[PDB]
Copies of this chain bind each other. A is one copy, B any other.
Amino acid sequence: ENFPIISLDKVNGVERAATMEMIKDACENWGFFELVNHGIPREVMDTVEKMTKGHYKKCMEQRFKELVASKALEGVQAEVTDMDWESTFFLKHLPISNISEVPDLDEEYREVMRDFAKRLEKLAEELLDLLCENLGLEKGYLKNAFYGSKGPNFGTKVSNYPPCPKPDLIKGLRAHTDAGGIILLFQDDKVSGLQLLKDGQWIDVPPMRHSIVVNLGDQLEVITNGKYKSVMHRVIAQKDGARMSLASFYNPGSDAVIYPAPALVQVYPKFVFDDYMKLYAGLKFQAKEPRFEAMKAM
């Protein structure tokens, strides 16, 4: 039925009508959609890509130096094949940007990301609004829902990785859905290795240049009372290309209260986003009582 690839700028022209419905359709039947002409200068994306990869290589050169020294201590000879090429770090943008405080980063690099973080936040809120429109909600409803008190939690995960040694290794690998609100993914190359589960079958995200892959989390499923479901996915390092990935998450504020939009209404539960994340980090059952309640439910 074809993965929805969408040109954002068309929501400013005569085709808006058709474009707005690709979004609606993608939202209800895919949980994902790939964006192009999304507004982020191909200039900025390239600069973000070149600088990220640079920081990475510097970390790796330093990582091998340490590896050799550490291995020697144990009378072992460190080879390059002993290297751990995986490296990931996060950047908080909202409600508080720790970008100025993240370790070993160039100031020119910090400013690039400071700006990218701002452009993505803007793109995130436009998409949220276009969703409201397709949903029949007032403008900024979702942005408001996510506000809580201090505002929404926007951050970026920056990963660098080698390819998976052999595809068969990704066999029993569990899949999942994102617990947050809306996710904006930016990758290098054309082929990500990202796949979503549609109708019990795995579907590849079409390789596009300078695209931003967008996907909905569990919070939007609750807020839409099921209209838009969060889909299961997995990214698998392709010997092909994609070896860098910047996954930015735009989630509700810690204290935000999630519940199906009254107008959008079985019914979904109401709750503080934070309880949902604690139900996640298993911090909800270190107590006897809850456990006894959990078992009583089943």
Interface residues of A (CB under 8 A from B): 57, 60-61, 64-65, 68-70, 72-77, 79-86, 88, 90, 101, 103, 157, 159-166, 168-174, 176-179, 193, 218, 221-222, 230, 234-237, 239, 243, 245, 268-269, 271, 275-277, 279-288, 291-298
Residues of B near A245 (CB, < 8 A) are: 81
Find out whether the CB atom of B283 lies under 8 angstroms from the CB atom of A269.
no
Q: Which residues of B contact A61 (CB under 8 A)?
A: 169, 171-173
A281 neighbours in B (Cβ, 8 Å): 69, 72-75, 282
Take A80-B236, A80-B237, A271-B298 as given contacts and tell me if A85 and B280 are in contact as well, using a CB distance cutoff of 8 Å: no
Given contacts A168-B57, A292-B222, A297-B297, contact A73 B75 (CB under 8 A): no
> A57-B169, A291-B179, A292-B269 given as contacts; is B81 within 8 A of A161 (CB)?
yes
Q: Which residues of B lie under 8 Å from residue A286 when comparing CB positions?
A: 68, 72, 174, 176
CB < 8 Å neighbour of A178 from B73, B77, B178, B294? B77
Determine whether the beta carbon of A243 is less than 8 Å from that of B282: no
| Residue of chain B at shortest CB distance from A79 | B235
Contact between A285 and B292, CB atoms less than 8 A apart: no
Residues of B within 8 A of A88 (CB): 82
Cα A41 to Cα B229 in complex, Å, equals 56
Query: Can you sample 22 A-B contacts with CB below 8 Å?
Result: A57-B171, A64-B173, A64-B174, A69-B281, A73-B281, A80-B164, A80-B237, A81-B245, A82-B86, A82-B88, A84-B84, A85-B165, A177-B288, A218-B292, A268-B296, A269-B298, A275-B295, A279-B285, A279-B291, A280-B282, A282-B282, A294-B294
